Design a protein around this ligand. Sequence first.
Ligand SMILES: Nc1ncnc2c1ncn2[C@@H]1O[C@H](COP(=O)(O)OP(=O)(O)OP(=O)(O)O)[C@@H](O)[C@H]1O
Ligand SMILES: Nc1ncnc2c1ncn2[C@@H]1O[C@H](COP(=O)(O)OP(=O)(O)OP(=O)(O)O)[C@@H](O)[C@H]1O
Ligand SMILES: Nc1ncnc2c1ncn2[C@@H]1O[C@H](COP(=O)(O)OP(=O)(O)OP(=O)(O)O)[C@@H](O)[C@H]1O
Ligand SMILES: Nc1ncnc2c1ncn2[C@@H]1O[C@H](COP(=O)(O)OP(=O)(O)OP(=O)(O)O)[C@@H](O)[C@H]1O
Lengths: 486, 577, 136, 124
Amino acid sequence: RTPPTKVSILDIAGVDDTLQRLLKEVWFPLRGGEACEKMGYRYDNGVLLHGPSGCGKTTLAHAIAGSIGVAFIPVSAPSVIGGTSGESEKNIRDVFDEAIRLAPCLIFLDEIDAIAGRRESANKGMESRIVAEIMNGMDRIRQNTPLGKNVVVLAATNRPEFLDPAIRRRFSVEIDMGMPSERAREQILRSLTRDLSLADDINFKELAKMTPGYVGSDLQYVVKAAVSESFQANIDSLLAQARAKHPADHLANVSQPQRDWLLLEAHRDEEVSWPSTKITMEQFRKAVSLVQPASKREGFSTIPDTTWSHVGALEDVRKKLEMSIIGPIKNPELFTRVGIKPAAGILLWGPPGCGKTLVAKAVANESKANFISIKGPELLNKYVGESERAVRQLFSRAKSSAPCILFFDQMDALVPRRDDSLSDASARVVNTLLTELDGVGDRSGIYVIGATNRPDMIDEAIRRPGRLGTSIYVGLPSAEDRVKIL
Amino acid sequence: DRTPPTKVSILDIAGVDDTLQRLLKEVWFPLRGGEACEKMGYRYDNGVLLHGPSGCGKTTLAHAIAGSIGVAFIPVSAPSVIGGTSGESEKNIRDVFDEAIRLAPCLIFLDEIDAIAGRRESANKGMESRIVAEIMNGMDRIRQNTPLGKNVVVLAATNRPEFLDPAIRRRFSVEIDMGMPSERAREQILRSLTRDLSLADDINFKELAKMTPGYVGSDLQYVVKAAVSESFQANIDSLLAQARAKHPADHLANVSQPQRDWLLLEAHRDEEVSWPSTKITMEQFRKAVSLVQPASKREGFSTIPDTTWSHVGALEDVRKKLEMSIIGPIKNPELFTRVGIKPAAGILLWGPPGCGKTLVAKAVANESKANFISIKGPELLNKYVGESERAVRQLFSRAKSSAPCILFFDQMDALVPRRDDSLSDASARVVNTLLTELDGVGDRSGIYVIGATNRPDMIDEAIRRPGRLGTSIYVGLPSAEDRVKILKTLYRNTVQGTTDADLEKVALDLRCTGFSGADLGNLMQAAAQACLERVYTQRQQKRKEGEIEPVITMEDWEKALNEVKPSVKDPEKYMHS
Amino acid sequence: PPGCGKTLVAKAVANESKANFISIKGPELLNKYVGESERAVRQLFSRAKSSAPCILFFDQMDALVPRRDDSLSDASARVVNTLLTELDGVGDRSGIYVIGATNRPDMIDEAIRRPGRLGTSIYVGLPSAEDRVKIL
Amino acid sequence: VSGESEKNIRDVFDEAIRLAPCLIFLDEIDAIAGMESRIVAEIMNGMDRIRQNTPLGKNVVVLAATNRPEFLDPAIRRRFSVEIDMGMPSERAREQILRSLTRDLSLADDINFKELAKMTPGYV
Ligand SMILES: Nc1ncnc2c1ncn2[C@@H]1O[C@H](COP(=O)(O)OP(=O)(O)OP(=O)(O)O)[C@@H](O)[C@H]1O
Ligand SMILES: Nc1ncnc2c1ncn2[C@@H]1O[C@H](COP(=O)(O)OP(=O)(O)OP(=O)(O)O)[C@@H](O)[C@H]1O
Ligand SMILES: Nc1ncnc2c1ncn2[C@@H]1O[C@H](COP(=O)(O)OP(=O)(O)OP(=O)(O)O)[C@@H](O)[C@H]1O
Ligand SMILES: Nc1ncnc2c1ncn2[C@@H]1O[C@H](COP(=O)(O)OP(=O)(O)OP(=O)(O)O)[C@@H](O)[C@H]1O
């Protein structure tokens, strides 16, 4: 038997355009059987969902299957591989025959990337005949369906690149469930905290405005952390009661948290009830800080703990940076209304010891946004392939976790002047950096801050506006500025 | 077994007129002219090989041909014969071949023959080799066991002829390439697909053919499926409205609109209603065409920039050249071909930074309304030795397939370095491959290459030789009067004292001599920043020490002009040598 | 001047000699293979010797042997030495003669220009007005 | 011809040297000299045994033909130092091989194979 699930649409939100298009594309073939029979047209389709991991594809498919209510066959990627050389080939055929026989139905091929990888990149025979068997059978439903009861093939992957373009041509309606936006994130938060005793003073808009780039799973983890924060007080009460019942002066002298664990063993079977309470907004503010976003791919250095109180004098540069980066980052609406794009950034220059690095670190700390630091020319790699892919991947993360502040320290070595043919590895990283800074492809939300001591060694194609071109002199403080800085 | 069914007819397939005509003298004749060969006394031991883009109808073509001919046929698929127990695969192959010989004459179709007859070197199993040799030996058994009156031809189809073992590929003497359908072929296949559909007479199939350059048969099948879905979308709305009105309380779920509609759909489920057989309008086809774009969605084409000519000021000469060289021929090829301007290989922009070569290229890509590919610097180089040039070859194959297309080699300095010195050696195989592939794309092919750079001295001088990108269009610093138009356009792209009569005064100031387009943009941004700074003073004095006004004042431009300097210093270094 | 009518000049000599005419389109023989890069050169001369008499055309001569002021690229050295050996082996009586074509004499390997090997440098002129009429 | 074909080649070679003089030819030797490595080892041992076991007055020559010299084993390449160049086929050769293609073909009397070869310079 292949019954539906119980994950009804109320658990999915923020994908209204995707949800409506999938409605128009999938609901009709599974409910227009009368319409198709009247038209006499063999209507079946293959819909494939691709995008960032955790956007909800595996749950969107389950919700759709539950809503439709027709027979639905969960078919995971590795549950189809058998022992003997040919058992899996017959297993795929059996799956498709079970689908076609019990029509109409919905087929979900979860993680199709693993079993339907590119044949040229996987020349071992077994997965080759697996891909060939899927290719052969997928047209069997198109040819041999009894008209009135068709079948739709649905699949979800976190990566479509390794998918065979041959099998990709079969799947017509490709839907890109991208990373949710602010309005989408607020709706997702509401949908997740639909059935929680949440406090009446909650502001979902305040949450959404401070969620730069989280994903549905990230918001799920936010809710989960908030739940535990709400019960921390009751855990403390239980700990106090356990301490009180068995004082023995002190059960241990090793430490307090370890003594807590040792005490919690002393009861185990002693069941206790946990009363609940409304989850406070401050608890949500704490939980979002405790949980780490999906952008934790070791590419965002910890924010420096240097506020403006750590820098003295430098009023002009501080005001200019407040106007240029701190301004738009804190009140984007005001700057957008005037018509100012996300600033390309600032290229600091001056003699060493003037504190430009400290000013940049202070700006990064004040922004209260995701920050990326690059310790000089660490991007360059021995292999030719990675030397540019590192920069492109860095900018991909920066765009995906917008807004973000980029701090390329010591432009001098990372991007030397390419006017004359000096070297080859650097001559390509400079070109890819120029292409990424203002070439084709939007980068709203990226601010590039560079510091160097040799302004006349960077390619003049970079000091141009649209890239970090607004250079700011930072030099020796005057006689009176020394009093303030000291 | 026995004979194929008539589930698919010749009418069901179209757009293969040349292929079908060539195949007529290759499969039909040595199945009905068996008496002709018997009197001729000539054995026909050859294999017809079908190859082309995926979904060109090879699987349907084989079934249609088999049904039309009517001779006994056994469908043989690559996974359909592989067995678990050892020797069962040879048993299957030999028994199928013996049945074919016994029931002569017959046709044999081997779908996805590449999936079996691949490469024996890449896999070490001793089970694929027995089959790759059994194909050969059974083929020879047909070569021997024929009475010269009942000859058997084997048909093989695949989407990757290269992946086949060349030893097997040698004896498939005739390889038939069902290439990408042309303009008339797409119109014919569209008619064949919409043979059984109710269509209003206002539909112009010429427009539909003209709007689908890079499409395959399966592509148009998906397009017509989308058209049918759009046709029934109206009844979908009617049913949704009726169901929503049926339910009480007006509003039931305040979660979201589409989710509420989904819930209401399951709320009744069995309340089916008659589905009107509405006619498909041409507007529905136009809508459906813009959605479904497969066979070219494999990350090969970037999103089209949303920059029209309204986003660029001045630059009338380069715009005229681009319109008359690239934009024009795509829109109306016949007029240009009559005057002797074939689809060019492309052009090569070059100039100091800040002029807007990238902006011009993006605008041309947007106005062309064709498939666009952007190569962001050296995205082709790979750590593996055999991938760096394979990327270039695959890119040009994709560009050739989806004609017309625009290839944008931004910052070619990283792709075609001046190799007068020993700057690089492992990238020589890249520039050589790029030159070979550029020479492989000829006139009337439909591929245009647009490249830009900041240093004309870094690009290899072999590029500028004709045939390759030899049409160099220079873009320099805009003149004093051009800055007026540039400022007007940029301010029109911002959103009140606009006061366009003072834009010339601002631009023509002696402090604004050597700025470029990006430099005027920076000056405008600085003026807006000065205005916003004044906003803080006004808000913190009139209100805090006693409103909101984003209107830019004239004095702000003068204030910002002092603190802004030209970006490029010596363009003479950039333009000559 | 660039490669406007060098193929015409080579083909006229081939036609008057009434021998075989084999041409290589510059940067085509050099592909991702390095072992077979010299093998292709060897095979071309082998077939030319088999089909003697023959004339061999190398347009865009820069694509094979630029100036080796810096003999760093090992594959380039492997190609140039093998090509020099094969062309030097058969230049007197075998009936095979190789034609070198390029745009500038000064971007070719120096070890070729000296006598014995391809040392005969000939300047091809631009078409005249009467030629220009036919070209139009 | 994985051990049984090697025994068959031993059967051929031992009788060839035993029944001397004799002519031995192995057609498409490349396709079985890439099991095949065992075939190459058998060929090496056989050529050595012909070198050492010949009566010195009645020997046998291992003759072979390959569609591509590069496919053969480099050791076989050095051992097979005797080469004969079958270059561009002659006009008479092309005409006669055309007639050797058309034995059982039902052809009219108008065929003149002489001119076809004369206008077939670049074919094999
Ligand atoms: N857009 C979303 N709206 C609501 N919940 C979401 C969303 N995306 C993810 N979730 C939550 O994430 C959990 C399941 O996510 P799941 O792993 O299925 O996502 P996915 O995008 O399909 O992942 P993958 O592509 O890696 O399979 C559930 O708790 C679900 O509520
Ligand atoms: N204006 C300033 N305010 C506060 N501290 C300062 C200032 N200028 C310098 N310092 C102090 O001196 C040091 C400056 O180090 P920093 O990394 O900022 O140098 P830099 O001039 O940017 O040079 P480098 O290019 O080597 O990074 C720090 O210890 C910092 O505390
Ligand atoms: N010329 C054509 N006439 C009619 N239908 C066509 C044509 N070309 C493609 N189609 C349609 O597109 C699909 C082609 O599927 P099919 O399996 O036959 O393709 P293929 O070229 O054999 O591909 P593959 O090599 O992946 O098997 C079918 O739905 C068929 O109706
Ligand atoms: N003539 C112009 N008209 C309008 N906007 C312009 C003009 N010139 C520059 N700009 C603006 O400044 C930006 C300059 O970036 P762009 O990449 O187009 O410059 P470029 O001079 O072609 O140099 P490069 O491509 O080498 O970076 C443009 O994207 C656009 O926003």
